[PDB]
């Protein structure tokens, strides 16, 4: 028997909250980058890697973590993700001295492991908790919560910590931040103890009801996924999109400031505009897939509009009209961020009934791999040739992704599971 449970909204609310906190810790060093250089006495190279360290950790650690999902269940993953998120925050405030930078690094690495238990989960949490209609929008809300942390992590950190020169007074203001994040993370950890069950009393969908019945080697499931040509094409195309989005967000500050001397306040606002606009895009994408369930057609059109946004952004950025960048970065951030819940849910369609922890996990690895490759490669291109070739470099790889996306078949397998009734 299929019956939706009321707890599903608390589960996503709690998960999106501690994914919000984990995303806060990702960019809390980037927002205060100028000050953290002065406090710890390190180069900007080190502080940038406190955010980049999440990318290198996801790639190797996912396959063990994605293996823990079947063996120990979903609850252990969220508990480990929230507890390490809490532990990684309490290690931070052991480092309020200029000479205690390594404690910050190991504190961030603990949060870095905590992401692997978080970022690939939205597809898995939505499947096990939500019905056939809400399954697409629930994954969007979790991505919506994750993106909210980046938005909160852009405007809150510069408020709590002023740009003061005295270390002793500076350490106090940073300490309040670590208590707030540590306090929030510990409270969210306590919530995960209570409300976050392993699975509802009844299956939420006929797709999940069939998934449990048919559910053997972990390496066998990996082998099946890479035999699927459609999934392999989706992994590459999703990586080229989400990877370019990570390359866009990380490198946008240096591109905008290059054309507009000064204007760092607006440059931070443009970076916030993508995150805020992406919040609308993520939710709209989830609701649209709920009503229409046209995963293949939506993926192609949304991904093309991502290419169009890059084409417009590349050639209008040089124009010098700063108010244009808000719309183009906002429009582009609307579609790339709306692609993330769309990519995760399209992967589940192509790879049902294999676990959503691996399918959306391998999509994330591609995003991390291309996100790293595009970050350094576009960084050298911008330094050596300027930002205009840097954006065209992203445009070319988004063009190849556009062609490959057109070759993905509409092999929606979990839709067929619900149709049988």
Swiss-Prot record:
Tissue specificity note: Expressed in non-hematopoietic tissues, with relative abundant expression in brain, placenta, lung, liver and kidney. Also expressed in hematopoietic tissues (fetal liver, spleen, lymph node, thymus, leukocytes and bone marrow). Found in acidophil cells of the pituitary that secrete growth hormone and prolactin (at protein level).
Annotated effect of mutating residue 351 to R: In PVHH; reduced choline transport without affecting localization to the plasma membrane
Record-annotated membrane-spanning stretches: 1-25, 44-71, 74-93, 101-129, 135-160, 166-195, 229-259, 264-292, 295-317, 321-350, 359-384, 387-409
Keyword annotations from UniProtKB, A to Z: Cell membrane, Disease variant, Endoplasmic reticulum, Membrane, Mitochondrion, Phosphoprotein, Repeat, Transmembrane, Transmembrane helix, Transport
Outcome when changing residue 368 to A: Reduced transport of choline and ethanolamine
Membrane association type: Multi-pass membrane protein
Molecular-function GO term, any one: ethanolamine transmembrane transporter activity
Spans within the Cytoplasmic topological domain: 72-73, 130-134, 196-228, 293-294, 351-358
GO CC annotations, alphabetized: endoplasmic reticulum membrane; membrane; mitochondrial membrane; plasma membrane
GO biological process: one example: transport across blood-brain barrier
Ranges in the topological domain labelled Extracellular: 26-43, 94-100, 161-165, 260-263, 318-320, 385-386
Outcome of mutating residue 246 to A: Slightly reduced transport of choline and ethanolamine
Binding-site residues, choline: 22, 26, 115, 119, 246, 368
Cell location: Cell membrane; Mitochondrion membrane; Endoplasmic reticulum membrane
Top-rank taxon, per record: Eukaryota
Effect of residue 200 to S: In PVHH; uncertain significance; reduced choline transport
Reaction equation(s) it catalyzes: choline(out) = choline(in); ethanolamine(in) = ethanolamine(out); heme b(in) = heme b(out)
Disease linkage: Proliferative vasculopathy and hydranencephaly-hydrocephaly syndrome: A rare prenatally lethal disorder characterized by hydranencephaly, a distinctive glomerular vasculopathy in the central nervous system and retina, and diffuse ischemic lesions of the brain stem, basal ganglia, and spinal cord with calcifications. Hydranencephaly is a condition where the greater portions of the cerebral hemispheres and corpus striatum are replaced by cerebrospinal fluid and glial tissue.
Assembly information from the UniProt record: Interacts with components of electron transfer chain complexes III, IV and V including CYC1, NDUFA4, COX4I1, ATP5PD and ATP5F1C; these interactions occur in the absence of heme and are disrupted upon heme binding. Interacts with ATP2A2; this interaction occurs in the absence of heme and promotes ATP2A2 proteasomal degradation; the complex is dissociated upon heme binding. Interacts with HMOX1; this interaction is potentiated in the presence of heme.
Domain notes: The N-terminus contains histidine-proline motifs involved in heme binding. Can bind 2 to 3 heme molecules.
Function: Choline uniporter that specifically mediates choline uptake at the blood-brain-barrier. Responsible for the majority of choline uptake across the blood-brain-barrier from the circulation into the brain. Choline, a nutrient critical for brain development, is a precursor of phosphatidylcholine, as well as betaine. Also mediates transport of ethanolamine. Choline and ethanolamine transport is not coupled with proton transport and is exclusively driven by the choline gradient across the plasma membrane. However, the presence of an inwardly directed proton gradient enhances choline uptake.
Record family assignment: Belongs to the major facilitator superfamily. Feline leukemia virus subgroup C receptor (TC 2.A.1.28.1) family.
Protein's name in the database: Choline/ethanolamine transporter FLVCR2
Organism listed in the record: Homo sapiens (Human)
Residue span relative to the full protein: 77 to 500 of 526
